Design an enzyme around this catalytic site. Structure first.
Site, mmCIF file in Angstrom:
data_model
loop_
_atom_site.group_PDB
_atom_site.id
_atom_site.type_symbol
_atom_site.label_atom_id
_atom_site.label_comp_id
_atom_site.label_asym_id
_atom_site.label_seq_id
_atom_site.Cartn_x
_atom_site.Cartn_y
_atom_site.Cartn_z
ATOM 1 N N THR C 16 -26.351 -4.805 -6.717
ATOM 2 C CA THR C 16 -27.426 -3.875 -6.365
ATOM 3 C C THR C 16 -26.985 -2.399 -6.419
ATOM 4 O O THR C 16 -27.642 -1.559 -7.045
ATOM 5 C CB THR C 16 -28.006 -4.284 -4.977
ATOM 6 O OG1 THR C 16 -29.044 -5.249 -5.178
ATOM 7 C CG2 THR C 16 -28.574 -3.118 -4.213
ATOM 8 N N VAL C 17 -25.854 -2.105 -5.785
ATOM 9 C CA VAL C 17 -25.355 -0.745 -5.699
ATOM 10 C C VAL C 17 -24.896 -0.246 -7.059
ATOM 11 O O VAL C 17 -25.210 0.883 -7.441
ATOM 12 C CB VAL C 17 -24.226 -0.623 -4.653
ATOM 13 C CG1 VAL C 17 -23.730 0.807 -4.576
ATOM 14 C CG2 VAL C 17 -24.721 -1.087 -3.293
ATOM 15 N N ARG C 48 -17.622 -10.387 -12.015
ATOM 16 C CA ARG C 48 -17.308 -11.805 -11.945
ATOM 17 C C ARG C 48 -18.322 -12.663 -12.683
ATOM 18 O O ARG C 48 -17.960 -13.603 -13.397
ATOM 19 C CB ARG C 48 -17.261 -12.265 -10.491
ATOM 20 C CG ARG C 48 -15.997 -11.911 -9.732
ATOM 21 C CD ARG C 48 -16.031 -12.656 -8.398
ATOM 22 N NE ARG C 48 -15.218 -12.049 -7.346
ATOM 23 C CZ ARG C 48 -15.544 -10.956 -6.657
ATOM 24 N NH1 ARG C 48 -16.668 -10.284 -6.904
ATOM 25 N NH2 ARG C 48 -14.722 -10.525 -5.719
ATOM 26 N N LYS C 107 -16.182 -0.416 3.194
ATOM 27 C CA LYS C 107 -15.790 -0.030 4.566
ATOM 28 C C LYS C 107 -14.735 -0.947 5.221
ATOM 29 O O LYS C 107 -13.962 -0.497 6.065
ATOM 30 C CB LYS C 107 -17.006 0.136 5.505
ATOM 31 C CG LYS C 107 -17.780 -1.155 5.869
ATOM 32 C CD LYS C 107 -18.579 -1.725 4.689
ATOM 33 C CE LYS C 107 -19.596 -0.733 4.178
ATOM 34 N NZ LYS C 107 -20.326 -1.311 3.015
ATOM 35 N N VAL C 134 -19.778 4.560 4.733
ATOM 36 C CA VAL C 134 -20.317 4.774 6.087
ATOM 37 C C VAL C 134 -21.681 5.458 6.072
ATOM 38 O O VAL C 134 -21.823 6.547 5.528
ATOM 39 C CB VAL C 134 -19.413 5.682 6.958
ATOM 40 C CG1 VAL C 134 -19.851 5.599 8.422
ATOM 41 C CG2 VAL C 134 -17.935 5.353 6.783
ATOM 42 N N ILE C 138 -26.559 8.992 3.873
ATOM 43 C CA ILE C 138 -26.358 10.118 4.771
ATOM 44 C C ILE C 138 -24.981 10.748 4.504
ATOM 45 O O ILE C 138 -23.957 10.067 4.591
ATOM 46 C CB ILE C 138 -26.434 9.699 6.275
ATOM 47 C CG1 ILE C 138 -27.720 8.913 6.595
ATOM 48 C CG2 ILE C 138 -26.334 10.927 7.164
ATOM 49 C CD1 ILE C 138 -27.751 8.329 8.023
ATOM 50 N N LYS C 207 -16.964 0.989 10.019
ATOM 51 C CA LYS C 207 -17.488 2.323 9.778
ATOM 52 C C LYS C 207 -17.080 3.320 10.860
ATOM 53 O O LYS C 207 -16.686 4.448 10.556
ATOM 54 C CB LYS C 207 -19.001 2.229 9.642
ATOM 55 C CG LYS C 207 -19.431 1.322 8.484
ATOM 56 C CD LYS C 207 -20.947 1.124 8.455
ATOM 57 C CE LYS C 207 -21.392 0.602 7.102
ATOM 58 N NZ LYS C 207 -22.729 -0.089 7.165
ATOM 59 N N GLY C 304 -28.826 -0.134 1.338
ATOM 60 C CA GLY C 304 -29.803 -0.179 0.246
ATOM 61 C C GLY C 304 -29.290 0.404 -1.069
ATOM 62 O O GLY C 304 -28.391 1.231 -1.094
#
Lengths: 431, 431, 431, 431
Positions: C16-17, C48, C107, C134, C138, C207, C304
């Site tokens: 996803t990221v 993978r 993290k 973390v 933000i 975190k 997300g």
């Protein structure tokens, strides 16, 4: 000597209230005899079902022939607890023909045939009393007829049907639909298998008719009462009313208006600050406005075994006192006085002034413009509007003649943009 | 013929209530005559100040000699509106000696001398009535004596002093100090220049004594009533009570306890959900618990011109009806029955069970440990505590015998860490 | 010329990221190139699963051998998105050995092996960055390391795990049990099939460890962090906290105390007025207290696809700028500086000062007396107590050394009258 | 060796912020030197008042000639803290001509002359930074320019003037008039004797202009910003907004719209649920919406001594790092990039879409009909209306083009039935 001959009482029907009545008379015997001036003694009960009556009777003699009660020359007072119109009507008239007093809980009979019954009672010189017929154990008839005798009554508003109040309370507290609140109420025994008289406002309108006769000194005119029940009320309505500052109650209103008397039962929004707005569960309350005293409120249980019995026995004491004191009728005995009646007409609902909660579904910006122009054409002023591809629009109107709202609603429902009907629910400040 | 001879009424005192009474009798003449069975005609008023009385009298003949009323053989009923103990006591006794009925609004006289007055009335065969003496226009005596005759009364709680309720309402709403609410009330005419009877609970205790006599069928025993007023109440107390879920009212409680009767007036915390907790301004309410009917509530104005007049005239009608019907006393006439009294003792306040709000100022962690151990030693259970270099600590206790709280408070006040006293205010659920 | 040679980036993992990162780099290419001073070009991704990666890759070359990325001499920056400890640890160390920078979202790896990784990076002269590790999108690391460089950081508190915050938000809003909120969250995809790291506070503690290293300039010391999760929290706790004026959050606290640094994750009551107390759903927030600036708050999504990608790309830009400007290390490059570390010790939880919500079940009046004496013996001051044949008793304590509360709780649990344990939940004002 | 030559800083102006800056540099010297890579040393301050400056300077050399700072060849960085347009503009331009970097807190200068200043800085190859010019100690420029570099910024909303927020907070909390809140604020030192820039939205619009330049990569265009202040706001407005579910803030909005950029400062109703709606007192907050990250919020103090100093010193560190690393400009240095600007036009207020709170005084039922028809003619949809011999009528509209509302308002004000003007206040969901 005075005070040595018991007054002899006979029952028609027994049931919950009858059993309660026997229990209350026995348990409070000392005080009852003190106030009455003589013993009040129940001789027998006429009942339809002998076996079911045995459990409630505590060994009181029972008979299936009601004339063993209404034709027995020794019986002085008949307590009528049958409910319904027939055979109660026939037995009551026969009790009167025989010179017996009648104490009744039968709001249906009294609301429909009160005029003929009281006329026959006054001619014969007997009493018919009906404290237990309205608001259960709350002594509202005594309050109206005796406590407030120095007052012109301007209006009264009542929560006087326990089942419909329980449902409306539950809906507000729990947020559920009318349908499942009604079903849950039936399962827990707060509503009977056929709840028509409760949810349709018929029971409340029987009682309001009686209250109106005593408040204003007019004949019973049940047929002329406006009645609307609660079954069309939605979850949304209860929630919107809450957000707007109101509670919804099934209210009976009897009021002196400019050209007549209002006699109406309907769901109504009451500002949440009012004491009557916070009368919940199966409790009853009657709010009475007199010219000298201002608003007074009477609150308590409006049904149930011992509360109803309490009112029956109070009536037994009243009747016993006047029977003994005044058989020559030096003073008036009847709470409803056929020789002292006013002919003030009852207003049709359309001739009545009230404020409204209006909720409708509509599809454009021009939609509100048309609605508001329609309202102005019928001289209706808006207090508030809230719009919570169809939108639900809510309108609170100022006080206005109902005819105006009927006509305006028909034009609004004619708008192409409006699908379905305009749900109206009336709104009363009571302040 | 019946109904042709007017009953002749004389007044002692006039004032606001007297003027009101003349106005109400004239304005509602039709209904009053209908119910009474004959005209009720006011003949004259004995007044101290002739000039001030002229404005209120509407041309009714006036005299400064009260014996022109109580010794006039033609006067059938005396309405006593003087207030105070003397000369009301003397004139009332003389009215009775002369075979006249008395209708009074004088709660002070009735609470203090009711036993001797009713005894003298029963011996003579006259009526003394006092509906207007308690809760103004609310027909509470009629409700207790007649409506609830089928009930054993377990307890009643009343807000029955308008001025002290107005102050406590204003303090809660506006947040101001007792001192300036009292001053503002005096300026706007809600409190009189000497408000002692109001703010000290004396007026309420006169009325509660009367209510207790009729509820329980016992002698008047005012001297044995516990009374505490509102003047020690702080802004903090009203606010803390609000945050904790309670309202503060000056309440009269009369209650059947295990070994006696409670007769007490004091500030009390009532849960905010209760209807009586929300009875604000100058309104009165009496909550009555009967065994058959359950809790019932009577609400309205408890003072003022026309509300009081309303009750006076209702009493005039009652007295007139029984005077005419039953001069031979076939039935009991008096609401207080000297030949039917119970000797149940009144409990001292210390023998009474109640819950408490406790607020104290203290300096350490060991402070709470000592306080709680002291409470446990006196068998006192805590419901809640809140601590809002001295800290204010607030305790709500469970229901407990007052003696226990007195003893525990003295130990807490003995703690080095505690400066000043423990402010107690009682707490009643009424549910 | 400058600005003509693209920097070449390789990915480890995609998911996803990773897909998000490719999308963000392409879509914002213009601004990214402007700020970076040269194009940032992704060359390939080691994955993978080749088939599952195809849908997310948008035609980017893929390989199953991660050394095609970390050993390719042309790749300047490695983006590590594998998660977990191995093989991420090995590949990251190899990337560093080869003179490549690393941008990571991992993290877990950074919290556990950060000391060894940064030491190896500084020796080699490469950058390892972890903004995306973390609080998602933000920019808290940039804020702490660069924005607040002029500040001594006194403490920070963070809501930094989205799943545990979503559950605690849902419990409060809907009133349901932890169990079914967790199940419902899994069904709607807010919680993964094995939610251990989320509900046990492990993710948040990874975190927080990182935040603590950058806030205070200390080594990563995850093993020394106190962690407690949410699974023991009841419906009653959430409701009681609400009534008492608090919200319950899973908070990470890192704070300079008198003799050490607090590093702790636990459920905690925060007064409802605080902004951080109202940070609901899957949102993250970090509240930072600096000596010069006071409290500052950073709020947004903490997980997300695109929020995480946003932070990865910001790190790519930072690394690219300094790589190009300063290959000779005239200025420090690493956000974590192995040659500038303080040895301030982490405090055990028992050596930490905090306030408490305490809830216990007990059977007498002496029960409270014993409890309060036990508390005083351990020097614990009570703020409030509420008692909502066993009763639930709730205590809010003043701020106190945890050791004291541990010892006092053991004595309370030893009381015969106490069945079960004392549920503790910590309480922080953050004001 | 690197790191041994201090960078030499000179100040223009001192005051509160200057004194703060000297204190922060000294107190955090260790961390500042670590991050910067060399010592940052303040050499002297040019001040107008020598005596008043002595108390704030801590023995730093002072001079009344600002060219002793901007022409001293040894000074590398000038910190400009004069405020105002002149002489700040002249000294800043001269500092640049001399090859010195400038760190400024001067939002007025930067908003008005930023284009010419940055152009001159880029030509010369120096940095001008302005973190301390917007939102005080909140690192919003760093967040926008560096943290959110991977994002297209869709819009931002800011509370960025402490005084106007303090007033609006106080009005809401205390219920008092603007006039006496402003007077009380001046007395307690929250507002300066001439508060024009604060209450008229000018200060906020300086800052918003700067935020807009960095968010969207456009020139500074202060002249094109719409600004409206708070002085016309009434007690009624604050209370009505509260009852309707909103808070009122003075907000700066910068937003990409369909055909341009919105740049506007005005009072605005924000739903009470939003975090930014609850940012009270003198605190600042900027809410930023990026395409990748979603909404993020930065909160803290937006003025005051040490918060502002904090941002000045952060800028000193940034400038020092890049000065040392990259004197040949391999990477871009300026936060505002004259060679990378977009020409997207600013929209006039009338071309902007927003929702409205409308409050007017009017005299009939036809009044509402006319108003609603006027609104429909201008295509304006109503959300709600409330009518709390003239009545105050309140309207909440749906989102609509401002031109439409201007035209509709003029027709409404033309109605005979309407006395006075229609008070508009804008409404933004920010959700």
């Amino acid at each position: 000597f005075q005070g040595m001959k018991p007054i002899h009482v006979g029952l028609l029907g027994l049931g919950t209230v009858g059993g309660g009545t026997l229990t209350v008379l026995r348990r409070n015997a000392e005080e009852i005899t003190r106030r009455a001036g003589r013993e009040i003694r129940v001789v027998r009960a006429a009942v339809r079902n002998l076996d079911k009556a045995e459990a409630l009777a505590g060994g009181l003699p029972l008979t299936t022939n009601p004339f063993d009660v209404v034709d027995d020359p020794e019986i002085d007072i008949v307590v009528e607890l049958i409910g319904g119109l027939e055979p109660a009507r026939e037995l009551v008239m026969q009790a009167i023909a025989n010179g017996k007093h009648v104490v009744t809980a039968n709001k249906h009979l009294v609301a429909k045939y009160g005029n003929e019954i009281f006329a026959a009672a006054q001619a014969k010189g007997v009493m018919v009393t009906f404290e237990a017929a309205v608001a259960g154990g709350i002594p509202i008839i005594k309050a109206l007829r005796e406590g407030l005798t120095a007052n012109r009554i301007e209006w009264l508003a009542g929560i006087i049907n326990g089942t419909s109040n329980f449902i409306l309370s539950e809906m507000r507290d729990k947020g559920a639909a009318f349908d499942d609140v009604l079903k849950e109420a039936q399962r827990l025994g707060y509503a009977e298998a056929d709840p028509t008289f409760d949810i349709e406002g018929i029971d409340a309108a029987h009682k309001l008719t009686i209250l109106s006769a005593i408040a204003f000194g007019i004949p019973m005119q049940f047929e002329r009462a406006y009645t609307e029940g609660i079954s069309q009320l939605t979850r949304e309505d209860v929630r919107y009313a809450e957000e707007l500052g109101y509670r919804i109650k099934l209210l009976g209103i009897a009021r002196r208006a400019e050209n007549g008397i209002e006699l109406r039962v309907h769901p109504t929004l009451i500002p949440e600050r009012r004491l009557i707005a916070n009368v919940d569960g199966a409790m009853n309350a009657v709010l009475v406005k007199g010219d000298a005293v201002g608003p007074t409120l009477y609150y308590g249980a409006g049904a149930g075994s011992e509360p109803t019995a309490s009112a029956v026995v109070a009536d037994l004491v009243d009747v016993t006192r006047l029977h003994t004191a005044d058989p020559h009728h030096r003073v008036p005995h009847l709470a409803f006085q056929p020789d002292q009646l006013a002919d003030t007409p009852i207003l049709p609902m359309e001739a009545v002034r009230t404020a409204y909660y209006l909720r409708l579904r509509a599809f454009r910006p021009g939609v509100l413009a048309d609605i508001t122009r329609i309202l102005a054409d019928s001289s209706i002023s808006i207090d508030a509007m809230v719009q919570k591809e169809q939108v639900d629009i809510i309108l609170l109107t100022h006080v206005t003649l109902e005819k105006n709202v009927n006509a305006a609603i028909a034009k609004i429902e004619a708008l192409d943009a409006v699908a379905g009907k305009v749900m109206r629910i009336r709104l009363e400040d009571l302040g």
